[PDB]
């Protein structure tokens, strides 16, 4: 809804829960748990591992999503004047139309590139697999991380 911000719900593995882990293999369970923990609770990792995971995520999901959303928003700006004539110009109306179109296309493109590339990044990335083997999180770690992520989202909503 309009009251709260929900861009974090369907991005960065926030939707991973125990159902994703019950049916997964041991290695796949480790990969999923590590991905959720690294995206949501980076404090559980050493700072060097945090930097490595941020670098591997940015060039694949985060910054790529930002760029795709920017391009899709630029698609909606073929003509910036939009409604405009010699007799009258509509600067405020055109600004409103841009603020209604470009954010929508940005959201669509960002959600698309997350819906396409995030599962492949989780399942077919060497850095994620290596760091998951390095950390080897358990189900209790995933439960604690889920609690911490929900509490952090609540705190961000409060502030």
Ligand X SMILES: CCCCCCCCCCCCCCCCCC(=O)OC[C@H](COP(=O)([O-])OCC(O)COP(=O)([O-])OC[C@@H](COC(=O)CCCCCCCCCCCCCCCCC)OC(=O)CCCCCCCCCCCCCCCCC)OC(=O)CCCCCCCCCCCCCCCCC
- Residue 100 interacts, among ligand X, other proteins, none and using kind-specific CB cut-offs from 5 to 8 Å, with ligand X
User: Residue 13 — left, alpha, or beta (φ > 0 → left; ψ -120 to 50 → alpha)?
Assistant: left
- In terms of CB distance, is 49 or 109 closer to other proteins? 109
- In terms of CB distance, is 26 or 158 closer to other proteins? 158
Interface with ligand X, residue 101, by CB under 6 A: yes
- Alpha-carbon distance values, 140 to 30, 114, 145 (Å): 12, 27, 8
- In terms of CB distance, is 51 or 151 closer to other proteins? 151
According to CB under 8 A, which one of 22, 78, 87, 159 is a site residue for other proteins? Answer: 78
Site string for other proteins, 12-51 (x = CB under 8 A): -----x----------------------------------
Strand partners of residue 84 = 89
**Residue among 115, 147, 101, 107 nearest 6 (CA):** 107
Nearest-angstrom CA–CA distance, 103 and 115: 18
User: Which residues here bind ligand X, judged by CB under 6 A?
Assistant: 100-101
């Amino acid at each position: 809804f309009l009251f709260y911000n929900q861009q974090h719900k369907t991005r960065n593995g926030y939707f991973i829960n125990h159902d994703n882990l019950m049916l997964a293999s041991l290695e796949e369970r480790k990969k999923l748990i590590f991905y959720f923990i690294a995206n949501q609770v980076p404090e559980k990792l050493d700072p060097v591992d945090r930097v490595k995971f941020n670098e591997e995520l940015s060039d694949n999901l985060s910054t790529k999503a930002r760029l795709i959303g920017s391009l899709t928003g630029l698609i909606g700006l073929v003509g910036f004047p939009y409604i405009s004539t010699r007799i009258y110009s509509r600067p405020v109306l055109n600004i409103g139309l841009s603020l209604l179109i470009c954010p929508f296309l940005y959201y669509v493109g960002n959600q698309l590139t997350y819906s396409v590339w995030e599962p492949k990044f989780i399942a077919n990335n060497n850095t994620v697999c290596e760091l998951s083997k390095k950390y080897n999180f358990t189900v209790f770690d995933f439960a604690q991380a889920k609690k911490e992520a929900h509490l952090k989202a609540l705190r961000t909503e409060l502030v």
